[PDB]
Amino acid sequence: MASRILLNNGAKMPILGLGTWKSPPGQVTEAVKVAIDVGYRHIDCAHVYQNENEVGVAIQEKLREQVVKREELFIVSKLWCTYHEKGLVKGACQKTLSDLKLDYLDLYLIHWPTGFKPGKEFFPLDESGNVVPSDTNILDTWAAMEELVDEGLVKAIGISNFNHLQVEMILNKPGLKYKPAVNQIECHPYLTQEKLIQYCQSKGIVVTAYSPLGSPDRPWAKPEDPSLLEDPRIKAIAAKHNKTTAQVLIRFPMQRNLVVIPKSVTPERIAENFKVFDFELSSQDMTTLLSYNRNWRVCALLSCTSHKDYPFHEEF
Ligand SMILES: NC(=O)c1ccc[n+]([C@@H]2O[C@H](COP(=O)([O-])OP(=O)(O)OC[C@H]3O[C@@H](n4cnc5c(N)ncnc54)[C@H](OP(=O)(O)O)[C@@H]3O)[C@@H](O)[C@H]2O)c1
Ligand SMILES: O=C(O)COc1cc(F)ccc1C(=O)NCc1nc2ccccc2s1
């Protein structure tokens, strides 16, 4: 298991990164410092997570300490839905750069394929609770992302939560200049994504798996939801390998040629989650884990389901 995967822009991306959604601003600086100390070289960020400044403090301190060189880090962020408008994309990227204390991003993603009305509110709603769309389309937003590459603000661009028809739309964009390097999507044994993954990989697009542990700290969790970390079938595979269930859940996408970005602010877990390069799941383990698919999503917000570009109506 090599540590980095080659992207279609010629750069190499670490297959294990640290997630930062829900990482409290008073804890995430130390979390990222610990992560870098124990070997992480890829951090997954987003403006909408409201903690980029604090993530940036950690990155900058480790650069200043000369624990790691900037060239050895792979920092990812994402353009929020309220910034899809052409004239807002660069400023959104620059705000993220300023908060992260970087002069470039390794990868910048369209966070969701849905544009929302610009403003201070991340989820602008009408009086009945429906998200208010913007009249932007994914193709023009993509052209705006391409400009960021051409101004040196980002080394690679990509997409997130795009279904295969939406990926196809970009691949078929008139005058397409840069193909997406990555599609970052939810993926775990309850949402295995065989079709979308094969499609993306067949086009040379690297897939990143988010919520690989099933996001047990998601704020909308319900008692009746399935629970990966507590699934006796997955625990059994972990026991066989003398690893934790979380370690199995992280190793699983790695063996599908995916990048994976588990989140933690707990130092012991940050370290545990990185110790996944010293064992191998069997082909049988892999197919067995795949067999647990439920088409169950952590991320699929009801208020956005009428947006014309809502991604999860399509089969894949
Ligand atoms: N592109 C998108 O739309 C999108 C959507 C969702 C997520 N993401 C990215 O993917 C990252 C990961 O997904 P996620 O945050 O939803 O959830 P996740 O990584 O599946 O799970 C995080 C949860 O698992 C716990 N945890 C971590 N390591 C553990 C271990 N070894 N043993 C037991 N529990 C453990 C964490 O607790 P503690 O932190 O308390 O240790 C936290 O409650 C996000 O942080 C974000 O960077 C992107
Ligand atoms: O979107 C993420 O990366 C993680 O989820 C969130 C993070 C935040 F900081 C704030 C909100 C969310 C959240 O509600 N995410 C669930 C979402 N589902 C859809 C569906 C269509 C369009 C946009 C969204 S956002």
Q: Where are the domains of the chain?
A: 1-316
Atom of ligand 2 minimally distant from the CA of 160: 3
Q: DSSP letters of 256-304? A: TT-EE--B---HHHHHHHH--SS----HHHHHHHHTT-----S---GGG
Atom of ligand 1 minimally distant from the CA of 18: 47
265 annotated ligand binder: yes
Dihedral angle sign, alpha carbons of residues 236, 238, 239, 240: positive
Cβ neighbours around 14 below 10 Å, total: 20
Ligand 1 centroid to 172 CA: how many Å?
33
Ligand 2 binding pocket includes 114 (Cβ within 6 Å): yes
CATH of domain 1-316: 3.20.20.100
Ligand 1 centroid to 253 CA: how many Å?
14
Q: Give 122's Cβ-side CA count (13 Å radius).
A: 9
262 annotated ligand binder: yes
| Residue among 246, 236, 243 nearest 269 (CA) | 246
Tokens coding 266 = 């707990």
Active-site residues, by number, are: 49
Tokens 């991604």, located at residue: 311
Helix axes 164-171, 138-150, angle to 10 degrees: 60
Tokens coding 52 = 């980029």
Resolution in A: 1.0
- Tell how far CA 172 is from the center of its chain: 23
Residue 245 DSSP label = H
Helix or strand or coil: residue 212? coil
